[PDB]
Design a protein around this ligand. Sequence first.
Ligand SMILES: COc1ccc(S(=O)(=O)N(Cc2cccnc2)[C@@H](C(=O)NO)C(C)C)cc1
Ligand SMILES: [Ca+2]
Ligand SMILES: [Ca+2]
Ligand SMILES: [Zn+2]
Ligand SMILES: [Zn+2]
Length: 171
Amino acid sequence: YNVFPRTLKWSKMNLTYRIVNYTPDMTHSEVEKAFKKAFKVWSDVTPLNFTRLHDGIADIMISFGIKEHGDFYPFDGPSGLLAHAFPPGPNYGGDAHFDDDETWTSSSKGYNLFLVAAHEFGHSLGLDHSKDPGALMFPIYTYTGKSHFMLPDDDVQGIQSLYGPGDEDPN
Ligand SMILES: COc1ccc(S(=O)(=O)N(Cc2cccnc2)[C@@H](C(=O)NO)C(C)C)cc1
Ligand SMILES: [Ca+2]
Ligand SMILES: [Ca+2]
Ligand SMILES: [Zn+2]
Ligand SMILES: [Zn+2]
């Protein structure tokens, strides 16, 4: 049973994460919405368990990425790359990093963390992608997390069904 390596949705009904998008044009209050609110929408599509244990137990997080890997250069102006997320494995999984050279906000101008973040998190915690037809995963985001409707049902029901109940049980 193996074909397209894109799903990672089975044994992860609950996970922890950290909120630290950035403080460019928004304030601690906005980032609070970006990370929380965007999470409110992600939870709306799927009852995913998320906990930010500052104690040091986080798997995914929202934060502006700044070239710190050592392989490919993510940050790069408005280039085709606003949010790169990693697989929830080591302490660098579900790492939601936005091309620091891009723009992010919680208002009607630019990428709304609700959208971008709900999208990056959907990846960092979800998997490679899941919107062939239409979901909050393609390089297009136009409709904010809630600026019209769940057009991207692919990500809505997609993770609402795959990330819904977790298994983490080998038969
Ligand atoms: C809200 O929907 C979107 C979220 C994030 C992006 S992105 O960060 O610009 N980007 C999409 C993309 C850009 C260029 C080429 N291919 C894809 C991310 C992404 O997919 N994040 O989930 C890339 C860098 C992986 C776009 C829309
Ligand atoms: Ca870019
Ligand atoms: Ca991590
Ligand atoms: Zn990064
Ligand atoms: Zn995507």
